[model samples]
Target: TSFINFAPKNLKLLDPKQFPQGEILKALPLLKNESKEKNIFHATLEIKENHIELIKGKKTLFYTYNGLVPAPKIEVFEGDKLEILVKNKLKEATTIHWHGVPVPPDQDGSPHDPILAGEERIYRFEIPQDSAGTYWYHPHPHYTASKQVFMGLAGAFVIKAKKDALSHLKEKDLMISDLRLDENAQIPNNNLNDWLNGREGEFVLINGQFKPKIKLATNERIRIYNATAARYLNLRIQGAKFILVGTDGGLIEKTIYKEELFLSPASRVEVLIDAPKDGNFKLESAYYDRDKMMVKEEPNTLFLANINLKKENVELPKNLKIFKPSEEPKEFKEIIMSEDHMQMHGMMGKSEGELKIALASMFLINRKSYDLKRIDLSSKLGVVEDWIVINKSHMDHPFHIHGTQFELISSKLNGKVQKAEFRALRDTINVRPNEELRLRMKQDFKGLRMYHCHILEHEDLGMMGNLEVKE
Candidate 1:
C-alpha cells in the first residue's frame, strides 16, 4: 500500500484483526576491530507516513514513521560522527529528537528546532564513549510529540564501544508499543489519566505485530528495548529461564535470571536465555492485574498490559556472561517519598499533582507532576545514590527515571516475595501496591534528567516530575 491510501477517518473504521501493528524486526551484529576514531555513520529521518493493512485483505490506512511506522534502526560506535538528514515531508514542521543521546542544544531536535515542509535539516554530532546502551530517536516537538510518535516516527539508536564490543552477543531489537484502539483496531479517543500520562495503548505490538512470536534457540542472546512511547512492560518468557546481561546504562556487572522484568518506556534489557528445546512456550505479562482494577477500600486502579503470547516451541540455554560491578560506594543517598507540598509548586502555581490529588488523594511522588522545562533533582558525575520508592496507594505504579540506570537493592512488601531478588541494572522499577523499593544507582554523565510514573495518561494529567544530574 502507498502512503496516501487512507484518510484519518478510515483509521477509525479499521478492524483490530486486520490492521498492520506498529512493530518491526531487527538483528545487530557486533563489529570487532572497528575504530571509533575513523568510523562515520550516516542516516536519514524523513517525516513521512506509510500505508499499512492492520487486518489481512482489508483496506490500508496511513501511519507515521521516518518512512514507515517504527522507523529504521540506526547503529554507530563511540567517538563516531553521525549525520542524520531529516526531511520534513509532512504538512507540519517536525523535529527529530534523539531520546537519550547527549547532543548540543541546537541538534537536540526540540520544538524550537523545526524542519519545515519539503525542507530538510542535517543533524551532525560525534558519539561520546562516556557510556554505551540502547537509546532511541523520535519526533519531540512539544504538544504534537505524543501524536506524531503515536502514529509512528520512532526507532532504536545503538552505540557500541571497543571494550564492550568484544563480548557483544547475538542481538535482536524488539520495539514494544501499545495502541489505544477499539476492538476494530481503530485509534480511540481515551481520556484516562494513565494513558495520557504515558501515551499508552491497550493492545501491545512487538515491532508492530499483534502478539507476534519469535523462534529462539537455546542459549541465544538478544537485546529487548522498551521503545514504547508511553507504556511500561512487564515481560516474561513462559517456561524458559533468562539471564539479564545489560540494562539502560549499558552492560551490567553480572547476569541475573528472573521470571519477569519491568521495562519502562525507553528502557532496554539485554538478556541471554536457555530455552527448553522440546517445550513450546509463549511470552506473558507477570503483573497480576491485566486490566485496571478498582477497589473501594484502596480506591486505586491498576492498568493492564494488552499483549500476550501463545505457547510455541523454543529452546533456551544456560550460562551467560554477567556484567561486573567495578566500584563499591562509600556513601549512599536515602530518597524519601511523600506527597508533594506547596514548596514544589514553584511559579506554575498548581501542577498536575495538585489536580490529581483533588480527583483522588491516593497518588503522589516527591509530590509533583511532570514538568519538561524544569529540572527537579541533581547528582554528581560518578557518584552512586540509593532511591527509595514507596507506594502508599493500593495500585502498583511503574516508576522510571531518566539520565542514568539503577539496580534493585531490596524490596519489602509485607515481607513477601512480591518481586523476588533481582540484581540487574535498570531504568524502570515497579513499586507494587503498598510496597517500598530501594534502588542503588550511580550517576556518570552530567545533564538534566527526568523521573516520573510510566502511566502516560497520569503523566499528562500531572503525575510526573523531573531531576537533573550535575557535573
Candidate 2:
C-alpha cells in the first residue's frame, strides 16, 4: 500500500504484541565526558545508518547517533564548558540542533551549516549559571528534520543546577517518540497528508522500548521530552498524583500539583511523583482535540508505558525550588502563524517536482515562507519585550523560540481574554486556532536565533524564520 493509504483514522497501527512488554525499563546510556578537567565535559557522537531488528529478526534501517535509538543522554552541571564532536557518516548532509540549549548561533546546527557526508565538526559552548533544565538534540537539515528525527535521531540533554533543591530525589529521564514501519520493516517517507497535518506513527516508545515498566522504589523526579514529530501528548498517570517542579526552562516559582500534563512537540517537563501502593498502572496519552483535518476520528489514546511501584507510600515534598518572576518589558511585537491554501487547490494537475514543493507550502509564518538569507525580525541582547502570538490556522501550532524562554502572560480565545495568574517559564506554548497569546521574552545572548512551530514537519516546511539578535 502507498504510505498515504495509512491515514491516521484507519491506519494499520503497530501491534504492541510483537514486542514483549513489562520488562525492566531501559536507562539511556550516559555520554561519558572525555575531558579530565573538573569544569570541562567533552564527548563525540557519530551520525550514521544502522540496520536493526525491532521485530524478531526483521531488519529495519534507522538513521541514528552513535548507532543507538534515542541517542545517549548527555548530563552536565551548570557553568561547565561543553565540547562535542560530531562525525557525519551518512550519504547526505545533516545538522544537529541543540534544542532548548543556549548555544551560540554558529554552533546551533542550522540547515545552512550542515556537516556534509564524511565530514566532522566540533561544537563548544558554555552552560550559563541559570541554564539548567531539560533540553534535547536533533537534526535540523532543511526539508528533512522530520524524516531524520522520525527514523531515529533524537536525544535528551539535561543540565543540572549547581545547587538543585531536589537533587536528593532519584531521577530517571524519559525520551518519548513514535515509529511507523512498513510490512517489509522499512520506514516510509511522508506523503501529502503527513505534510498537511504533522505525521503520527504506530508505535509509541519510551527510551526505545514499548510498554516498559518503571520501578518506583522511592519518591523520584521524572524528566519527560515529547520528542515525537507532531503528536501532542496529554499525558497523565493512572494511579498516582504528581507535582510539576520544572518546565522547558527548569524550576518554576512554586511546586504545583497536577493531575494531567500537556506537552506539544519539543516540550519537556519535570514532575515529582510519590511511590504509593504496589501494582501495575499506566502512563497514557489521552485524546486531545487539536482541530486538525486528519484527526477528527481521534488520534487514538496511546498506552505509552507501565508504572510499577515496588515500595510503600511516602509523603509528598512540601517545597522544592522557589523562583521569582522577571522584570518588565519595553517593546511590543505581534506574530501571525498561518498557512497557504493554494497548495491544496489545483494540486491534482501538478507534476512530481511541484508536488514536493507543494508539501512544503502547507505551513507559513506571517504569510511568509522561510528564507535563509532574509532576517525576518531583529532584537537587542538583554532587552525585554512582549510578544503577541496569533494562530490563524485550522489547528494548533506550538510556538517555540530558540536561545531563550518566556513567561506566558495571557491568552485570548473566542473573544475572551484570560490573564495568566501563574507564571511558568516555557520555550514552547501551543496556540490554538484563532487564539492569541501574550508573552514576555528576553534574549540573554546575541546571534541569529530561530523561532518556529515546533511540529517538525511544519518547521521543515516554511513555518520558521530567523531573528538576528544584536548587541
Candidate 3:
C-alpha cells in the first residue's frame, strides 16, 4: 500500500490573502564585502528575535540572523579564510553548523558546543581549494534545531572556484523552505504531531516568498537548495530544458539532461535552463510518497514560481570543474537503521531471545541511542572507507554526515542492485525502506563528527551517532 493512502485528511492549505497580489519577486540582499586584513575576511552574524511580515501586514515572530528570514548569503572564493563572529542575543542558546563545508572539528558546530545567550564566538575556517559548491548554514543545537529552522534561521553559503565557468551566465539562488502557520500567522508552539512526523508546511516558499516570479533571459542557470526541515521536493521545470551541472559537494564529471529532479532535505542541485522561446513557464514541485515515488495529478502538485522569459543570446560553458573520485576503499563498515527496538538489540550482537525481552524507543542507530559523551566509532584521518547503510524501517530517512561529502557507490532495493542515475557527490541522501545505500568518504580533518537522519525530529529523538577521526 502507498504511504499517501494513510495520510491525514485534515491538512490545511495556505490562505490566499496572505500572498502578494501582484508584486514582482524581490532579490535577496547579498552580504557586502567586509574588511580583509592580512588575507583574512571578517564578518559578524547577530542572532536576535524579531517580528517580520510574512503576509505583508501580519507580523510573525522569528529568531533570525540580522533580522531577516533565509538570513543573508555569504559568498567566498576557494583558498580564502573566513572569520565570523556570531552573537547570540536570544533568550536561549544556539550554534551554527557550516553544512557541507569541511572545517576543523572544533569549528564544525557540533551540538556539544553551543554559544549561550548574550555571548559570542568566532568561527574561523578556511575554504579548501577544491571545495566549491552550494552549501548552507543553520542552527544545530539539540532540542531546538527543528523549531528554529522552521521559524527561519538558515542561509546559503556559496564557495566559488577561482575561475568559475558559469560566471558569464545569469543565475539566481533559490532557498526553498516550508512553514506551518496558524490562522494568526504564528507557528504553533505545541504541535506534538509535527514534532514527531517532521513538520510539513502548507505553503512552500522560495527565498521566503510565495509563488514569486523571476524574469530571465533565454539561457540562464539556477542554483537551488532544499533547506526545509523534512519535506522532500520533486522538482519539474515547464517550457524549458535543463542540464544538471552540480550537486552538494561540487560539479559532476558529466552533465545530465532531465525533465525532472529530486532533492531531499539539506540537498542542493544546479541546473542550466535553456529557454527555446519567449514564453512563460512555471517551476513546480510535484508531490511524492515517503519512498520518493511520484503521485498522480493536480491536488498533489504545487506551483513554486513563475518564470518570465525573453529571447537573448547567451554563451554556455564548454566545461565545468572535473570531479575526481576517491581511490578504491581499503576498509568497509556496516550501519543498520531501524525503528523496531528489537532490531537494535540484534544489531548490538545480542541474541534474538534477549532482544525479545528488551524495550527501546523507535529511533536508534545500531541498537544504541545518542550519548553526549560516547563515541560510537573511530577512523584514521585521510583514509577512504566504504560504508554500507541498511534501512530496516518502514519510512524513508535522509541520511546526513558532517565533516565531508561522500560519493554514492551503489544502491540496492530489496536485496537487488538498482541502476545508477548520475554519479554526483552529496552530503545527504535518502534511504528507502528495505534498501541498502553504499557510500565512499574520506575524513580529512581530525575531530568528533556526527552522522544521522536529516529529519530533525529523528536526530533529536536519538537516531544519531558520533565518529571521531584521529591523527
Candidate 4:
C-alpha cells in the first residue's frame, strides 16, 4: 500500500481492543529532592507500576520513577559529580538517557546499554562546566520510549553554575506534560497514523497537576521543561510579560522579553515574570495547528495553571552571562528528513498488514531508518561543524542531538530567511515542514552520540541517526 492510499481520518481512528485494561493512577505531588552528601548527589530511582488519582475519584495505573508521577528534581553544581543508582523494578528492561549533558558515551545512557528487570545500574558523570541549564532524564529503549514516557518515567536534572545570574533569583521549577486518556481513563494504543503524525495528548498537565496554581513574587524566575512525549506548547501568561533568559542547552546571549514562548518535546526555557499588582492569573498553553501549519483562529487553549501573585517587590538583574560564539566552522554536513514506503520484515516479525502499514508510516533521517549497527556520520573532537538540516516531511519535527549543544545560525521557511538571531544555545529545535536550519556545533566530548527527533514516537519509528566523535 502507498502512503496516499490510506485515508488520514480513518488512520487516526483508534481500536478499542488495542488498549489494555488498566487503572487510572492518582496525581502525585511534586517530587522532592532525594539526598546529597559531600558534593556528591546520591539517589536511587526504582521503576515500578503504581496507582494515582488523575481525576477526582478516578484511579490510573502509572509507571513511575521512585513512585512519583514527575520524577524528583536532581540538581547539581557545575563540575560536581552525579551518581544515580537506578533499580529496574519493572517487568521489562529500561535505561535512562541524560538529555543534553555532554557525558561520556558509556555513561550517556543510550539504548546500547540497558538494565534488565531485577537489576541495578549506576550512572556516574561529572556536570560539565558549561552544562548549567534545565536538562531531563528518561527511558530510551526504542519502541517502548513513547509508552514509558507517557506513563511518567521522566524528571528534571538541573546544573547550577556559579556564574549563572538567574541562580541568585528565587526560582520555581515546572514540568509541563500532556496526556491522552480514553473513556475508561486508560491510554489508547497508537495506530499507524498516530505514529506518522506524532501522538498528541488531550489533557495538559503542569508539574503533574491539572489547573495547578503557582505562587509567584514579583520578578521571580520560572524554569519550565516541556516533558510531553509529542505535544508542542505555545505558553503565555494571562496578565504579565516575561523575559526569556535561557533555552534547552543554557543561557541566551541576551535576554528577550516576549508575550508567548514556544516549547517542544524535551525543550526547556527559563523566564522571569513581573506582576504589577496582586491578582490571580493563569498560565495558558495557546494553540498552534500542526496539521494546518498555521495558527488557528479561536484555537483550543489549555489552562495549565493559576498564578497567585503576591505584593512583594524585587529587582530584575541588569547584567546576565555573556555567550561567546564558536569559531567559524571548518566542516559542513547536510541532513535530509523524509519518509519512504518500504518492506519492514527485518526488525520485528509482524503480520503482512502490519508490515504494510509500518512501511507507509515510516519516518527517516537522510532517507534511511535507524540501524543499530550503522554509524551515520563521524566527527573530530574540539572542531566545530556546520550542519544544515532540511525537512521534506509534512509536519514539524523537534530535532535533538546528544552530548552537545548547537547555536542556530539561521532558519529559513519556504526559501525565506526568518528574522531571528542565533544568540540562544539549544540542544533540541523545532524544524518546521519544508524548513531548513543551519546550526554550528562543536563536540568537545568524544563518544557515540544519537541525533533524532524529540517527538518520541517519531524517534521510535526510525527518525534517528548516530554520529561518533573521535579523538
Q: Against the true structure, candidate 2 has what lDDT?
A: 0.82
lDDT of 1 at 313: 40
Q: Residue 233's C-alpha lDDT in candidate 3?
A: 84
Error of 2 at 194 (Å): 1.3
Q: Lowest-lDDT window of 10 residues in candidate 4?
A: 2-11
Say which candidate scores most in TM-score. Answer: 2
Worst lDDT run of 10 residues, candidate 1, spans 1-10
Cand. 3 Cα-lDDT: 0.77
Model 4, span 362-460: residue lDDT tens: 788998888877999999998999899888987788899888888888899987997456477789998898999998898888878899988887787
Reference-based TM-score of each model: 0.70, 0.93, 0.89, 0.87
As a TM-score, model 4 comes out at: 0.87
Off by over 4 Å in 3: 1-14, 37-39, 291-299, 311-319, 341-360
Ranking by TM-score: 2, 3, 4, 1
Which candidate comes out best when scored by lDDT? 2
Candidate 3, poorest ten consecutive residues by summed lDDT = 1-10
| Cα RMSD (angstroms) for every candidate in the order listed | 7.8, 3.0, 6.1, 5.6
Error of 2 at 446 (Å): 2.2
Model 1 per-residue lDDT at 83: 79
lDDT of 3 by residue, 337-455 (tens): 87753444344676534432332256678877778689999988999998899888877889998999898988999758975576777899999888999999989998899998898
Name the lDDT value of residue 3 in candidate 2: 19
Q: Is candidate 1 or candidate 4 better by lDDT?
A: 4
| Cα lDDT, model 1, residue 55 | 53
The models' CA-based lDDT, in order, is 0.57, 0.82, 0.77, 0.75
User: Which residue runs of candidate 2 sit more than 4 Å off their true CA positions?
Assistant: 1-16, 310-319, 346-354
